[PDB]
Design an enzyme around this catalytic site. Structure first.
Site, mmCIF file in Angstrom:
data_model
loop_
_atom_site.group_PDB
_atom_site.id
_atom_site.type_symbol
_atom_site.label_atom_id
_atom_site.label_comp_id
_atom_site.label_asym_id
_atom_site.label_seq_id
_atom_site.Cartn_x
_atom_site.Cartn_y
_atom_site.Cartn_z
ATOM 1 C CD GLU A 65 -2.778 1.473 0.322
ATOM 2 O OE1 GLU A 65 -3.250 0.472 -0.258
ATOM 3 O OE2 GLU A 65 -3.120 2.644 0.047
ATOM 4 C CG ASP A 93 -3.930 -3.171 2.367
ATOM 5 O OD1 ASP A 93 -4.101 -2.507 1.324
ATOM 6 O OD2 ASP A 93 -4.871 -3.551 3.098
ATOM 7 C CE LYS A 119 -12.935 -4.408 3.005
ATOM 8 N NZ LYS A 119 -11.765 -3.982 2.187
HETATM 9 C C1 LIG Z 1 -11.044 -3.078 -7.430
HETATM 10 O O1 LIG Z 1 -11.091 -2.625 -6.093
HETATM 11 C C2 LIG Z 1 -9.968 -3.001 -5.326
HETATM 12 C C3 LIG Z 1 -8.750 -2.345 -5.513
HETATM 13 C C4 LIG Z 1 -7.643 -2.710 -4.757
HETATM 14 C C5 LIG Z 1 -6.282 -1.980 -4.969
HETATM 15 C C6 LIG Z 1 -6.251 -0.539 -4.411
HETATM 16 N N1 LIG Z 1 -7.224 -0.354 -3.314
HETATM 17 C C7 LIG Z 1 -6.957 -0.900 -1.987
HETATM 18 O O2 LIG Z 1 -5.956 -1.505 -1.773
HETATM 19 C C8 LIG Z 1 -7.996 -0.687 -0.853
HETATM 20 N N2 LIG Z 1 -9.216 0.061 -1.123
HETATM 21 C C9 LIG Z 1 -10.226 0.273 -0.032
HETATM 22 C C10 LIG Z 1 -11.530 1.079 -0.356
HETATM 23 C C11 LIG Z 1 -11.618 1.265 -1.906
HETATM 24 C C12 LIG Z 1 -11.184 2.465 -2.457
HETATM 25 C C13 LIG Z 1 -11.241 2.673 -3.838
HETATM 26 C C14 LIG Z 1 -11.737 1.663 -4.677
HETATM 27 C C15 LIG Z 1 -12.171 0.454 -4.131
HETATM 28 C C16 LIG Z 1 -12.118 0.236 -2.757
HETATM 29 C C17 LIG Z 1 -12.613 -1.119 -2.214
HETATM 30 F F1 LIG Z 1 -13.074 -1.865 -3.259
HETATM 31 F F2 LIG Z 1 -11.589 -1.799 -1.613
HETATM 32 F F3 LIG Z 1 -13.636 -0.936 -1.323
HETATM 33 N N3 LIG Z 1 -9.988 -0.275 1.328
HETATM 34 C C18 LIG Z 1 -8.766 -1.026 1.606
HETATM 35 O O3 LIG Z 1 -8.582 -1.462 2.693
HETATM 36 C C19 LIG Z 1 -7.748 -1.243 0.513
HETATM 37 O O4 LIG Z 1 -6.565 -1.960 0.757
HETATM 38 C C20 LIG Z 1 -7.744 -3.730 -3.823
HETATM 39 C C21 LIG Z 1 -8.968 -4.388 -3.635
HETATM 40 C C22 LIG Z 1 -10.074 -4.020 -4.388
HETATM 41 O O5 LIG Z 1 -11.306 -4.680 -4.201
HETATM 42 MN MN LIG Z 2 -6.764 -2.463 2.716
HETATM 43 MN MN LIG Z 3 -4.215 -1.650 -0.506
#
Ligand SMILES: COc1cc(CCNC(=O)c2nc(Cc3ccccc3C(F)(F)F)[nH]c(=O)c2O)ccc1O
Ligand SMILES: [Mn+2]
Ligand SMILES: [Mn+2]
Ligand SMILES: C[C@H](C[C@@H](C[C@H](C[C@@H](C[C@@H](CCN1CCCC1=O)N1CCCC1=O)N1CCCC1=O)N1CCCC1=O)N1CCCC1=O)N1CCCC1=O
Length: 180
Positions: A65, A93, A119
């Site tokens: 991350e 992350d 999740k």
């Molecule tokens: C396609 O969407 C994803 C993208 C990623 C890579 C980058 N984003 C994170 O790494 C991450 N984003 C979030 C909240 C968030 C914010 C923006 C878009 C989507 C999302 C989620 F969908 F997660 F709610 N909260 C985490 O804790 C977190 O690590 C990982 C898992 C996904 O499902």
């Molecule tokens: Mn996360």
């Molecule tokens: Mn992340």
């Protein structure tokens, strides 16, 4: 737009964390001046990930991350080709070298149970560890394996509740909780 949330986020979080959250939201095509609740959420998630990596040994964690998507995926591919862990379908992350597993850190405004459920339904590899915190001071980790010592997680929960308190004092906590 003149948002109280934006100024609070800039006053509360570290400037470099704010810059990283801004770059992440701009790369994902979001306006930090408009999606102020998401701005605060991204900053909080980044800070929690950094505090998490701060715990443990010096070489324990590889931080995914914070990096841009291309380099983050490159480090994930390198870790997978080095250790042999299955490649995750979604960007995690952290990576624990001690336990040899990917860590997905989440921060929720609701109950940790629902958040962890979503999740675990999202991630299908199952080999990726999930550690969820909340703004109420609760936490839930996979297999009851909380990875870090009690103090490193306790300071994280303390910081989360301090952020919640400041948000409520500025009369912004209600909209932030309704945003999720
Ligand atoms: C396609 O969407 C994803 C993208 C990623 C890579 C980058 N984003 C994170 O790494 C991450 N984003 C979030 C909240 C968030 C914010 C923006 C878009 C989507 C999302 C989620 F969908 F997660 F709610 N909260 C985490 O804790 C977190 O690590 C990982 C898992 C996904 O499902
Ligand atoms: Mn996360
Ligand atoms: Mn992340
Ligand atoms: C490794 C390098 C920088 C690290 C930065 C990361 C975050 C750190 C912020 C710094 C400032 N500190 C350190 C003292 C307090 C503080 O506020 N902390 C730690 C507490 C909360 C926070 O915010 N840490 C953690 C270990 C020490 C450090 O500096 N980063 C940036 C994103 C990825 C990463 O690993 N890298 C790697 C490549 C790009 C870069 O810059």
């Amino acid at each position: 737009r003149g948002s109280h949330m934006e100024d609070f986020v800039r006053q509360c979080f570290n400037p470099m964390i704010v810059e990283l959250a801004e770059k992440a939201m701009k790369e994902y095509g979001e306006d930090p001046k408009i999606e102020t609740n998401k701005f605060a959420a991204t900053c909080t998630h980044l800070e929690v990930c950094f505090m998490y990596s701060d715990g443990g040994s010096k070489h324990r964690f590889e931080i995914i991350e914070g990096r841009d998507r291309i380099m983050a995926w490159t480090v994930v591919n390198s870790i997978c080709n080095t250790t042999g862990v299955e490649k995750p379908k979604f960007l995690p992350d952290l990576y624990d070298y001690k336990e040899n597993r990917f860590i997905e850190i989440g921060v929720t405004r609701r109950e940790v149970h629902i958040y962890y459920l979503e999740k675990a339904n999202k991630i299908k590899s199952e080999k990726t560890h999930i550690h969820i915190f909340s703004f109420t001071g609760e936490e839930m980790a996979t297999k009851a394996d909380y990875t870090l010592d009690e103090e490193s997680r306790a300071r994280i929960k303390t910081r989360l509740f301090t952020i919640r308190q400041e948000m409520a004092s500025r009369s912004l906590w209600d909209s932030f909780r309704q945003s999720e």
